[PDB]
């Protein structure tokens, strides 16, 4: 899985997400990466987000559509990503599952070119490239 | 603060260099993100995307991808085999059909009709680890 | 496509959605009916919704997850369905498309057993069955 | 106001009668909505759902379905051939696998492993109209 979202010089957003999925998955298994609203969601009036993690868990929470509606509601890309993760933690616990077994992260971008990211578990990084160059950051 | 690209994980740094070749020249974000992720699909040593991707339990490499532009146009393929670049086939679903998502055989039929070439995406390394997992 | 959502006597929600696709679709075409942000979404703390219409258009707008987040923001099931449709009308306009060529409808239910529905175009009905009886209503 | 069922279209009235047999007896909403939509999948004359559904371009009936309960458990199948009740196969994806969505051949393989029996879902009426459309 790699997800990528960008704001161009005209100020338009777009995103792409592609994967070979979970290794040794059942035949015919599909994760979050080809699902609009789960692996990727872009609204040019608000912003965009891509997800990382257990495909199943991102589908179950329609993760990336949630992050963008949270930026629509007025959250910064950072705040939207954190609040979206915090909602998913509450759901993992309501399902009596152990958070150590679930990983979901989001990176997000709005129309001003502000960005942000957050995850359930530590250890994921994302790359940011603007006019300060290309850098690896940690959510 | 534009143009700006973000992608997931460490292999995202070098995918971003590729996306930036389009963006620094005033190109479309749609073209930039397609080019960015295609780099990782192309790379056999990138084991979780495209060509080096680890297979399903029956040793079949099946890829999933989707793309979305700045005006709600969307394209998507899932559980498609033998095509190295699922993001371009998803862009073609978006641009060349009345549909938005194609899966399985039907996604490969369409890829081949659009001139995409049939390929073996299971590297020797991935067949090897798969068989090691079948033992375990 | 038939979508069905219910609140039981214990006060719990669930939903189901099933279809043969668009008649004479391309081999392998998938619509909104198997996609959890699009054809069906259920959150037991808030409510549930199922969609009707052109599969493509419900996927593009992650329709049913939008209706439920609108009830999460305090709209009645009716208001959430109408506001969700109104947002989709604005989007087909920005895509330079003719609304006469687009059909999308939602039916919704919240935790209190209130329900509602709305569509882009006339001509769709939905069936409601509670303790007062079964009935066909028009959004 | 509970229990209460809502479903889409005019045929939702008789699907609702079926769902209500579960709900009026204090049964689970999950069981009620599965039973409700299965009525329409079973009916060869309702040609937009299940058995009797109008095929794709090439004449195949491929069905899509998903189910979601009261605590974020989800199951989904898409473009599955030969199984009359995709909602029950989706319930089985939800309950019997660690996955959430299966498509194509892989969804049918799993259905058959769960004891669902392969059937011919193209009715004479649907082959007829399909061929009439191929002419047009």
From Swiss-Prot, chains B, D:
Transmembrane segments: none annotated. This is Glycosylasparaginase alpha chain.
